[PDB]
């Protein structure tokens, strides 16, 4: 009933996964990950790459595939009671996105930043590149899409549309690449906020302000 | 680490490192290891690498597993960038203090201005001990002696926490109240402005005045302690003293030079011609950190990295003494796995198939002549 | 005026000016004053000042209180910018004609390309007389002799007034009528186009054709008188003849050099070592236009600017004759208000605490040797 700790999954699923990763490189950063022309790189690090790309195409196809087919066909008449439950789960998807972005755009990014300072790169495929570019980014993009689709397929307001700011939010990362804009999130919240208040205007939200609160 | 992947001809024709020496192979935390040697900036510097007008004498390691206590090109201490001059040879000396226990492949590298870290040979050095043992003491012109490992650490932290807290304090103050969906709607139908009012706007200027106040107080408080301070010292050192080399007594001429694809060896047809007066023999060809020796003629003692030293890698069709006044053409082959391991064989992907090295000749009583060769190097497949 | 506020190390390590002389101290309008001397471009030129590939030999004064009649680097007249070469010494000669009555602090300065006026020492010169006396005559390859003070003045004025008048004439024609609030409203409700009509559009093309006409008439009339004209002569002069200096006989070595903060003096410990064959003494340390002398040894007669000449500013711990072959270490102290007045003391704000100067040594029979020193200069506070 209402909004569950299906959320606790969303927060810990990345946290555990990425903390395992940080350990994993932590031990093989030095050992294998220094000289790329050693055969221990083609096993502990290169194989890691091929594994993830494949896992990402797959889970992406499954995750988007799933939701697009379980798209609510008879959306026209379903209760405000669930138009809330769903709105909340949507918000969990966004928490999952934001968390996923944190790891990608802040964590592993400025980490790669440090890595460059300490060893001259042997490949465009350093450990922190295998993790920063081809693990971290696909993940938050997949999370991104998921959320978008969930909203489009699960909530009116979002269905019959394609939100601009939301589209921009989700595909934006596809036009972010280095050497040698994600604020859309606002627009898309101010939306999800309205989405919450269709029946849930009441209020509070204008009634129980003019009184207690 | 990081050579190997970089263009084979860049590595051949950029900086030649020789007479390298390392004072120790194994060292305790806080102990010193001293790297010495010479480097020549190759006269035929490639295009495409900005001339070393502003270069920096760096060290090739995985971070501060050592700290660089001192570095010297010519006689002079070199903490800045320095202007090196094409064609010239210099002697350098790096002095490293050990900081992190482990096995490090330390290189001596040049950092050049416009495109390129120019990485010299790397040698494995082992640090034993505990990082908790490391000290980096330094005495100021101000009286005090501090440890650079931790100096000013607590200060840094305080000021960041303090300000960070105040940032939180501000959002905190506003977030006692509800944040989004009521405040959003209030703005919508009808006016906002019930959402904020002094005592809100008193706190607003409380913060605003408090902030300017604390900044200026803090600053001239930081000026009270620490009244003697300089700006970051910077700026390229010119006038690097180059090494005065005697004109070489041998001259060589490279007629064709080929390599097998795929292979582990480079052949070249040299006309060695011995001016000056003592029977001379060829003992080494140095090419891209990789050193090929005729062990019938010369033997490394400096403990040059084992993966880069080809003990009898170099074979001369005729390496009998070359009498003074005499001049002969000879077929020379530099051969060793290092040619494939360090990817000099990757010259076949380079847009400029030209090599460059140093040959080392030795007379009877064992004093040496260094001539430098460069030429186009041509593949042969069939 | 303008040095002093510029970075003390730029002033130290950029161009050194010596053997300066001024033909006169007081001068009548239309009279000549000639500045001579030598300058060295310092081998350790800073980063940050583009090398003097395109430099200009200027004069530091408050506008044309003099005019520059001639200027010479090497033998050559230098009315363009010139390429000077780092390391080299040149002799210059500037020739000034006096134009405005007064007291002028005249400097000799170099103008450099990328960032910087490089200002030499300034001397006060006094011009007596009337500005109404000043003539700048010049004979052309075209026969005529004109006065540059007023040449082409009236012409300039006429054409400007004439065209300015026409400008007014055009607005004046339209402003006989009412300009704004009626015309604005006519455009508004209903159409404009009653606001303009030939005879308006006759006048329009009257002006239009008359303008094109007068321009072309005037131009080929200006071509008729003055049929012989060249383009502005420009372009950097290469091949500046540098001075051929004899290799110095003394060599010095700077081991530490310190300055007191705050203070008026710089100490340095030199190892002076006298090769060549006559007992040598130290007479002068020139640093940044400031000259410190040991009057025990040398006396300026050239009337070097009083505020920059420290008559016994230089003290040597031991300035007895230094025998040929002998070498000694000596403590030297340059000391004078000029060090604080010309703000060399402000080196403490510079991001490169390194100085540079010239030492002048004199043997028994009064002939001299110039060595240049540079080194880091380190503050001491406690
Ligand atoms: Cu690092 Cu070899
Ligand atoms: Cu300008 Cu004296
Ligand atoms: Cu070389
Ligand atoms: Cu000089
Ligand atoms: Zn990167
Ligand atoms: Zn060894
Ligand atoms: Zn006088």
From Swiss-Prot, chains B, C:
Cu cation 2 binds at residues 16, 40. The chain crosses the membrane at residues 154-174, 203-223. Changing residue 107 to A: Abolishes activity of soluble pmoB construct. The keyword tRNA-binding does not apply. Keywords: Copper, Membrane, Metal-binding, Monooxygenase, NAD, Oxidoreductase, Signal, Transmembrane, Transmembrane helix. It is found in: Membrane. One of its GO terms (cellular component) is membrane. M.capsulatus has two forms of methane monooxygenase, a soluble (sMMO) and a membrane-bound (particulate) type (pMMO). The particulate type is a nonamer composed of three alpha:beta:gamma heterotrimeric protomers assembled into a cylindrical structure; the beta and gamma subunits comprise the bulk of the membrane-spanning regions and the soluble regions are derived primarily from alpha subunits which form two antiparallel beta-barrel-like structures each. This is Particulate methane monooxygenase alpha subunit. It comes from Methylococcus capsulatus (strain ATCC 33009 / NCIMB 11132 / Bath).
């Amino acid at each position: 009933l209402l909004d569950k700790k299906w959320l606790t999954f969303a927060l810990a699923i990345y946290t555990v996964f990425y903390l395992w990763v940080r350990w994993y490189e932590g031990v093989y950063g030095w050992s294998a990950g220094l000289d790329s022309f050693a055969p221990e790189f083609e096993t502990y690090w290169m194989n890691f790459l091929y594994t993830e790309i494949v896992l990402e195409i797959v889970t992406a196809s499954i995750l988007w595939g799933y939701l697009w087919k379980t798209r609510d066909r008879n959306l026209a008449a379903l209760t405000p009671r669930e138009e809330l439950r769903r709105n909340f789960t949507h918000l969990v998807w966004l928490v999952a996105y934001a968390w996923a972005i944190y790891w990608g755009a802040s964590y592993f990014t400025e980490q790669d930043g440090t890595w460059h300072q300490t060893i001259v790169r042997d490949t465009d495929f350093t450990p922190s590149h295998i993790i920063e570019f081809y693990l971290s980014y696909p993940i938050y993009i997949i999370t991104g899409f998921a959320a978008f689709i969930y909203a489009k397929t699960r909530l009116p307001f979002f269905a019959k549309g394609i939100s601009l700011p939301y589209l921009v939010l989700v595909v934006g990362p596809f036009m972010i690449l280095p050497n040698v804009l994600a604020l859309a999130v606002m627009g898309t919240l101010t939306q999800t906020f309205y989405s919450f208040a269709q029946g849930g205007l009441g209020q509070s939200l204008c009634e129980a302000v003019d009184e207690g609160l | 680490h990081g050579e190997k992947s970089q263009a084979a001809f860049m590595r051949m024709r950029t900086i030649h490192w020789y007479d390298l020496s390392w004072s120790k192979e194994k060292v305790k935390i806080n102990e010193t290891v001293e790297i010495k040697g010479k480097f020549h900036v190759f006269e035929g510097w490639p295009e495409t690498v900005d001339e070393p007008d502003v270069a920096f004498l760096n060290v090739g390691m995985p971070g501060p597993v050592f700290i660089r206590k001192e570095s010297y090109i010519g006689g002079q201490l070199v903490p800045r960038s320095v202007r090196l001059e094409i064609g010239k040879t210099y002697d350098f000396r790096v002095v490293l203090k050990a900081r992190r226990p482990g096995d490090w492949h330390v290189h001596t590298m040049m950092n050049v201005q416009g495109g390129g870290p120019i990485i010299g040979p790397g040698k494995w050095i082992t640090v034993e001990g505990s990082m908790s043992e490391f000290r980096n003491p330094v005495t100021t012109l101000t009286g005090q002696t501090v440890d650079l490992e931790n100096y000013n650490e607590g200060n840094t932290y305080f000021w960041h926490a303090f300000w960070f807290a105040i940032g939180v304090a501000w959002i905190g103050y506003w977030s006692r109240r509800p944040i989004f969906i009521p405040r959003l709607l209030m703005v919508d139908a009808g006016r906002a402005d019930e959402l904020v009012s002094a005592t809100d706007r008193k706190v607003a200027m409380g913060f605003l005045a408090a902030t300017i106040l604390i900044v200026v107080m803090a600053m001239s408080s930081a000026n009270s302690k620490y009244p003697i301070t300089i700006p970051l010292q910077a700026g390229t050192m010119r006038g690097m003293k180059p090494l005065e080399l005697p004109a070489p007594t041998v001259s060589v001429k490279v007629e064709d030079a080929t390599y097998r694809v795929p292979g582990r060896a480079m052949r070249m047809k040299l006309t060695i011609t011995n001016h000056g007066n003592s029977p001379i023999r060829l003992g080494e060809f140095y090419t891209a950190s990789v050193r090929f020796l005729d062990s019938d003629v010369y033997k490394d003692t400096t403990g040059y990295p084992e993966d880069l030293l080809a003990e009898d890698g170099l074979s001369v069709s005729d390496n009998s003494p070359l009498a003074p006044g005499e001049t002969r053409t000879v077929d020379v082959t530099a051969s060793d796995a290092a040619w494939e391991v360090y990817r000099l064989s990757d010259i076949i992907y380079d847009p400029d198939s030209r090599f460059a090295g140093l040959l080392f000749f030795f007379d009877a009583t064992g004093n040496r002549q260094v001539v430098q060769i460069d030429a186009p190097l041509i593949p042969s497949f069939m």
